[PDB]
Amino acid sequence: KREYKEMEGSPEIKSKRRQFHQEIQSGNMRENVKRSSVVVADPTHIAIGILYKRGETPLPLVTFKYTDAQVQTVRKIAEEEGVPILQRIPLARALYWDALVDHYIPAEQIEATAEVLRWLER
């Protein structure tokens, strides 16, 4: 169900899928941060949530995207909820444009997401 499907469709349908999956999402900001493993950010611009739990998620999942001043609120909530936030500017930007929320990460972001998650695992 959470498959990104790189080889299926067109750039136009990928854009429709991104908007649709964003719009159908039911969670509020705190719910989205609390269900994430880590947040990657471009400070003052973008925050992307990532969920990865071995045996539950076959691949990392993008849980949310927030922009501009919402990033300040995301950082406050993450501190309250004990969710680590990392500065990863090119990764956050690439996931912003290309990733679908509530779907596995795009193939192009595997290397960079794995680097973040090696850090998270320690």
Q: The dihedral of CA 78, 34, 113, 16: what is its sign? A: negative
Taking the C-alpha atoms of residue 50 and residue 84, their distance in angstroms, rounded to an integer, is 11
Which residues neighbour 25 within 8 Å (Cβ) at sequence distance 6 or greater?
64, 101, 102
Q: For residue 70, list its beta bridge partners.
A: none
- Residues contacting residue 78 through CB under 8 Å, at least 6 positions apart: 33, 39, 84, 85
| 71 part of the interface to a second copy, by CB under 8 A | yes
Residue of the chain from 5, 72, 79, 87 that contacts a second copy (CB under 8 A): 72
Of the residues 3, 6, 19, 110, which one makes contact with a second copy according to CB under 8 A: 19
Region near a second copy per CB under 8 A, out of 19-27, 55-63, 77-85, 110-118: 19-27
Residue 87 partner contact from Cl ion, a second copy, none using kind-dependent CB cut-offs of 5 to 8 Å: none
Minimum distance from CB of 28 to Cl ion (Å)?
26
Task: Decide if residue 18 touches a second copy (CB under 8 A).
Answer: yes
Contact predicate 88/112, CB 8 Å: yes
Residue 104's binding partner out of a second copy, Cl ion, none, with CB under 5 to 8 Å set by partner kind: Cl ion
Query: Which residues, 75 to 114, sit near Cl ion by CB under 5 A?
Result: 104
Asked if residue 43 binds a second copy (CB under 8 A), the reply is yes
